[PDB]
Amino acid sequence: NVISTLDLNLLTKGGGSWNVDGVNMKKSAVTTFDGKRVVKAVYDKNSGTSANPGVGGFSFSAVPDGLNKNAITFAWEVFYPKGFDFARGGKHGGTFIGHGAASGYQHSKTGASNRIMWQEKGGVIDYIYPPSDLKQKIPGLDPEGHGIGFFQDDFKNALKYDVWNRIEIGTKMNTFKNGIPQLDGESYVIVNGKKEVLKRINWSRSPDLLISRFDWNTFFGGPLPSPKNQVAYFTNFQMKKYE
Structure with missing residues (x-):
């Protein structure tokens, strides 16, 4: 079910068939750790969102050759050394739908996003x-304020220390019938083999607005930034069929 795997040795040289762009390496680095080619994500103390002054994490976008705009999964592995402080959560990355804001406390009629966050205690x-102005039937799936979290009771302390945790996030567009979005989009999250699915989502308002990119942007919060200088390692970024 793997379509392609990002070669991190090409991360700032176009990403091969991933078409990686917008790399913000910050204080992070591609390196070798535990026999694997990884990105060492460096989170300084007080780093998080732009509201916080420190430097932390790294980002990139990708539109890989082979991206199924109607349904796709992205996957990666992350190693948290013992003692990492998860604070009260942060971002990994995920998929964006359409165009227009869909993060950063902004919404748009044309855009949506599906991301993994970590939480307290891993x-x-x-x-x-x-999207704004798009009907939903899931209670509280509202295009105002911050994003909407799901699965908090299913993945408590799922991210263990000193192990390669395996993460996946699937996104499946809703269908349209005579142009009306059909409230049959889906999302799923897998952590170390445990999968949870959310059904009945409207991901966009019209069939021209489909999955448009993978967006990686790892940082603490909001609203709390990293409480200390610390690192995590990410590896094995994959684009997979929606299962």
Whole structure:
């Protein structure tokens, strides 16, 4: 089910068939750790969102050759050395739908996003910014304020220390019938083999607005930044069929 795997030796040289762009390496680095080619994500104390002054994490986008715009999964592995402080959560990355803002406390009629966040104590959630002005039937899936979290009770302390945790996030567009979005989009999260699915999502308002990119942007919060200088390692970024 793997379509392609990002070669991190090409991360700032176009990413091969991933078409990687917008790399913000910051204080992070591609290196070798535990026999694997990884990105060492460096989170300085007080780093998080732009509201916080420190430097932390790294980002990139990709539109890989082979991206199924109607349904796709992205996957990666992350190693948290013992003692890492998860604070009260942060971002990994995920998929964006359409165009227009769908993060950063902004929404748009044309855009949505489906991201993984970590949580306190190494929990995981699905974290969604849905489009403005688009009907939803899932209670609280609202395009205002911050994103909407799902699965908090299913992945408590799922991210263990000193191990390669395996993460996946699947996104499946809703269908349209005579142009009306059909509230049959889906999302799923997998952490170390445990999968949870969310059904009945409207991901976009019209069939021209489909999955448009992978967006990687790892940082603490909001609203709390990294409480100390610390690192995590990410590896094995894959684009996979939606299962």
